[PDB]
Amino acid sequence: MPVFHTRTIESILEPVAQQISHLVIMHEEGEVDGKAIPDLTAPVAAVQAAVSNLVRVGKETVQTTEDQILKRDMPPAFIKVENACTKLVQAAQMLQSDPYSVPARDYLIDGSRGILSGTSDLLLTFDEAEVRKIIRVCKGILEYLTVAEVVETMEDLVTYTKNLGPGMTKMAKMIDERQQELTHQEHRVMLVNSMNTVKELLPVLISAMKIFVTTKNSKNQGIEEALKNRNFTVEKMSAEINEIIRVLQLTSWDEDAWASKDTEAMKRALASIDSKLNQAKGWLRDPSASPGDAGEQAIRQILDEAGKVGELCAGKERREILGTCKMLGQMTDQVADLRARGQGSSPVAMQKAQQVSQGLDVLTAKVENAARKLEAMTNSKQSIAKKIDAAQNWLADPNGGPEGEEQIRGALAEARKIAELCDDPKERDDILRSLGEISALTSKLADLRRQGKGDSPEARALAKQVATALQNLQTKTNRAVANSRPAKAAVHLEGKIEQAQRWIDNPTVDDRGVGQAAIRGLVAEGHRLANVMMGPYRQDLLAKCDRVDQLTAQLADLAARGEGESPQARALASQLQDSLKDLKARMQEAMTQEVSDVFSDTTTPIKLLAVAATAPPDAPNREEVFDERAANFENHSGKLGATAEKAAAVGTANKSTVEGIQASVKTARELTPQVVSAARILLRNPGNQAAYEHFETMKNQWIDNVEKMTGLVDEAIDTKSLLDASEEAIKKDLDKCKVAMANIQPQMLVAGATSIARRANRILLVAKREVENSEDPKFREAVKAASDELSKTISPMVMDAKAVAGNISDPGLQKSFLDSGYRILGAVAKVREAFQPQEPDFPPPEEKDEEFPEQKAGEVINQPMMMAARQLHDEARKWSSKGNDIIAAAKRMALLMAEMSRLVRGGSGTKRALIQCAKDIAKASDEVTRLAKEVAKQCTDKRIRTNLLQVCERIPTISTQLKILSTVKATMLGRTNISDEESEQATEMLVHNAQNLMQSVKETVREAEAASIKIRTDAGFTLRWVRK
Template identity: 30%
Template sequence: MPMYQTKTIASILEPVAQQVSKLIILHEEGEDGNAMPDLERPVNAVSNAVANLTKDTRMKAEMPKALITIEKAADLLEMACRDMKQDPYSQAGRDRLISGKICRDCKKVLDYLAVAEVIETMEDLVQFVKDLSPCLSKVCQDVDTRRNDLLNPYQRDSLGQHLDQVKTLAPILICSMKIFIQILGNEGRGTDEAIENRNYLSKRMTDEIGEIVMILEESARTDNGTKMTNGVSSINTNDLTFHEVMKKLSASLASKSSKDAQLNQQLIQHIVDLGFKISDGFDSQEKRRILQICNDLDQANRQHNNNDPRARQQIADLVRQLQLTVNEAVIGRIIHDMADITTPLKHFTDAVLSSETLAMKRMTVDEKSQTLKVFSNRLAKTANLVGFANARDKRRSTSLQQLSTQIQTLTPQLINAGTIRMNYPENRAAEENFENLKKQYNEGIHLIRDLCEESVDTKIFLQQTKAQIQNAIQTCEGGLKNRNVQTVIENSALAARLANRLLMVLNKEADNSEDPNLRKQVETAGERLKSAITPFVTNSKALATNLNDGSTIKTWRHGSQRLVDMVNEVARLFDELNMYGFDAPRQQPQVVQPVQGFQEIPIEITPPQPNHFSASPPIQNLIPAPPRPPLPSETRVPQRPPVPNGHDTDDEDGLFSTMPSGNRPIHHAAHGLYQEVRQWDHTDNEIIAAAKKIAFLMAHLSELVQPGRGTKRELLACARGVAEVSERITELAKEYGKHCTDKKIRTNLLQVCEKIPTLGTQLRVLTTVKATMLSDNVETPEDQEAMDMLVFNAEKLNQAVRETVGAAESASIRVRSDAGFKLKWVRKSVPWINNEDD
């Protein structure tokens, strides 16, 4: 975590650090024999500023280490100048909670929620609402204020999401309590269901508030979470997804450094372990493929010889093969399980609201309830699989896991609400309660689908969807030949639903882009695809009623061919627009309403007679899984060229010609950054030029923090240079992002670059603290703590710059041609060295 977390503290702490830096330089000049000015006033100013930081309890709680380190710097200066006594506030800020007041108010809300289970009269409910409302309103207001002050964008987003859930759930909980009270005295019919609804919603609110408290506490922690071993960061891979570990392993393998051999083997072993776990989520065919590659990779890793280029190449090939195989399997699962996520809920709702007799309704509702449960369990299992295997980061993985649990626990409560609605059709509270939970469920399943689809490779997704549409239509032809009505119905419905999914993908791409030409192309392709789906559904319905009519068969075949042609056109459009030519993380998806002209097309293809098969088939028959055809060879995404090796004209001093030796973690982090950006020519790319400059400054900083390697003035000047370049690279990234027409890529670029200036100024603060200790002859625990914080901050800054460079590269293909702000992304033509001595 960064050293400080909020804008408020940053606005106070950074000027203090600048004052301390000036005092350090003045003091150093005095030690060198220069005239010493009167330091009483500037030291008093620093001391007063430090004291001011301790006056606010909230700020104390937020700065356990940052305040102490600045206090130490001021204390050392005061002792050196002998002008003031030791600062009396050196123990301030020990409290670990970021805001005790907000957390106490959250506890009050939780206490009120615990009372919800004993309220059984309307009078008590009215009093409950009166007591809860002001406290809950204050918590929401304070949390929102705190959220806006946080520097970490992910913590801000998470707080906002949980806060929105609390605001949404509060009126739904009140409604569920109201319906419970109303039916409590009505012969007990539906009471059990109402109790379960109320308790579920109360627990959901309790959990959401608990998450808010956890994020507030997390934002107050400043522990590193990363340990140093011989100058190399030890990665806690248990906190990483399969996708993240793959990225780290690919980068590590590309370096070909003997020093990374042990780290490579650890990462490979972790990937193998994850692969074995992922295989459990698939059926026999996919499971066998994944297990085979994992076994081969495990064996190759055990026999690994880092000096043998063929062995390294074998491992690299197996790693890529495992990644592609898992991606293909996961995408196939998403396509199959999420081709139709609306029908189960629609059928259940229709059963609840039907005008049949109560006895008949109960039978139908029970049947549809079971179908809904099967669907929810399958969707939740797939969401967990995607979160574990393909989520781009831990945050998205956690979101999918939370949504998975939410859908599984919400489904029985939705069924309970439907049962109550069925028993009390005239009760407004029962109707409102059912509609509330339906909305929660519908938003949840759509958000799961969006999160799953944004976690996968778009090209493979498109190719597999196209292949399954073609396969479904071919299966229909087999059904025609055998006069099998059910086969025709199921597979024509599947083809239409999959085509409908492509229509929704186009909708998202059109909504995501601000390029009018691109939007026009996408919208035109969407209209053409839509014009093919609707008649295909109509023709399929006609075909289901008469498989023997030649004219009907001819019309259906013409419509199916047109559908295939339009699907191919969409695939070509995505290829031409290069929408999948990068690996950019996307914005957290929201439930988006389709734009005009892209509404999802209702697909209901029913059999000619009810007795052919049930009008409400079980979910496994609703979306059949046809034999999955192998992917065309052209769907394999080409690997990005490796980073150039050999002589580098940018590195004239040879700072990065070899891997840093010894315990030099800051230089090691700078080396990693430089290896990432050296592949680009910086001549007409100021972002690359700035990133390289940060790498060089970091390498220089690594030398200056060593005892006897430099002066305090040089150290502070180097840190100031890092902070200034950090500000510049952020300005460039933000300006570049303004001209990017892809909203998701732009949002990602702005989020990753937002961390850079904070980390840069924190580095300056920490370097100021370290500068006060350079003349000490004995290393103390405080010295080591300051060094650890400095190292951690430097690593985080290098990582943020690398992420920003990657996000800017992704944005380059979506920058307006008339923007006037251009960066040339030109790869260097440097020979690759692939021999044993590299």
């Protein structure tokens, strides 16, 4: 199993794997061809100097090292390569004498693989050492955070403050440097996102603690939220640090990446069903409730959160939960319906309203039971993790104590819960099996630790045998958990529709449920959007949703039978594959509008909350009025979060923005009650300057993260669309204004002028951002001016809106208002213009690219890979390679991969034709990266160029491993005889890299043409983007 989680490792294995690559061409050039191997005293002498110094430096390290784990793990490593090279120096002797020596041309192949694996495994050792040091400093912070609560003093807090600060500073540094070194960007993300949070939390801890050694000392009505936050703030930070430690130990694709998000998302839905249960019941507990108020929604929210969880389950529970939701909701339809006749008191109108109310209880029970089963695995997985780590050290010292051996007992016991909790007897078995060997060897080495500790590597052959076996067990278990949760659909809009399509096409072929899952996700977002709208709108959306649900149900059932190519199995495919199209569009417009309103005003509620907290100890309705505000706040923060999540969902941006948005969203959810408490602290503890410094901190902290989210959501909307929606909204606001003056209600008037001013201000924000994001003189100036005009248009309307406050019926005042009004709307068209795409200007025989070869009649294909090539090719297949090198390289490697979807599985002559397929791809890999970097440079749009470059840095890394990997397979494909964990895993990794690669290429193609419209003054020319 090769490992290349870092830059150094790839840097050292790249060349090595290269030499061997050459020792193989010959070895196969003699094994199947004609004339055998030549003389290789120099080549095989090269492999020597390489691994030589390596092994050497390892030796100086092993000796001069305090680390027990390096002491034990390192040595076996050197040993590996020594034999691997002294088996090639030998193999070459017989090859120098009797070149045709067959028994010698096998000292090579099996000696060729040794050099690789041996070097990887040695290097791997240095790293784990490197990581341990970080991890140590990490646990420190964790532990020292424990201490936090045991602080009631002041000078005591001070000691803390200066003891933590540095260690924290040291951690951040170590971590920074570390990610700088990873080759898995994803891993680099989590590390930085985690370290960020932790940083920003620190101050919060401090502040709380002081606000603590203030009230708790006083003994009044404030500590109720003091020990709260202080304790909460800590439990969060120690969670991220744990996450960091977790991510650090990684050396390949995240296994259970979604493990956290899942158990945490199942927590929001529970808390959300919990916080709306009553409210939706109170509706069915009243035949006199309006078919659309809060109550009608609460039922709907509950059912949303319900399927959210349902979706995290598998088949049975998944379909049972979703099924329930369907009828429960469809039933509410019948209910609120009959209320639409006056027979809400019909015996049925209350006998279905209870039928549903009681169903809500069954459903809540079902989801809770599911949440539990999923968190049980989560805990177990975590338990196992800590235990194997505690027994890591007990294995390092030949002088352990039954305790450490009691950590290995616990590990297997926990691994036993994961087995029970399992539902595929095959996986559970493979687990329980291992426990028997591990349990043994751990006992067989325990004895020897009293019967002559065997401090001399004689026990090592066990203490290592075990540490390794434990490692294998933690992998089996991880899959069990992984394989327990269904495959997820793409996060972003585009990715879903794509996946949706695929299945639509081949409803027969295994996507692993992904296609129908993507459809479910979309419809779910459709319902989410709709359950927020009104009249026919909410019902019209819901119509097309139910419409797609019905179509997919049908198509899936046909295909299920056998009919995977029938007439309706197309007529349906068509009615559906066109149904999403209308939906995608319907939802995007839909979300743009929602964003206009929810995000209009974001600081008001927090203001009243801020105001309230300070209010005079004698203020009337004190303690009742505030509460009315804390509510009104938490409620709004929720709606913001909800909305931004829809923008993430159905908007336009990649995992780039989506993650950042979902990021701020979670946050908001955390600091919402925090703030809402620090606001209550100061209420029952006025004056107390520690109360202002704290609550101010929190609020402003929340007020930041918001604008961070406000900005991002706006970047999910297409600027042109945003401006448009903004212009209409301003127009209709001017209408509510006219109706106010017509009915004489200065409050109705003002509220519209107010909203208008907000609206126009937002426009200025979008503009400023749009301008900073550009390097193009024309644009920045055009937009700059228009936006300058707009501002002057703002205040005059506001004061004129104020004048007509009094004389709402007085003309000359409403004229001076409406006049300044249309003056805004005027300037807004002026800024809309500056965004207008540019008006086109004024300045063959054929093109014959090669088709896609797939027809191989049940030939030895590797499905997963063939897919990737196919998908990639399909994308490039849309354009012409004519005047487009990126397209060419794409199209080429597409086919250059299908040629690999053949060699991957053993064969005849492969081993060479493979080492070539990779090299060929990697050379193409190098052309895209190079051209994409250029298009990036000619781009005046900082965002795109920043995205373009983002997909580039990945290609190189990817193609490299693709080489190193292929070089390995070639080593163990020459013997198409038996199968083992080695050949199997390496083949597995190969596909994964070939997957990431075909993806990063579609991406580079997309962003490449995206940046195509933002290039100007025509320097080095462009790529000719034209569809065929």
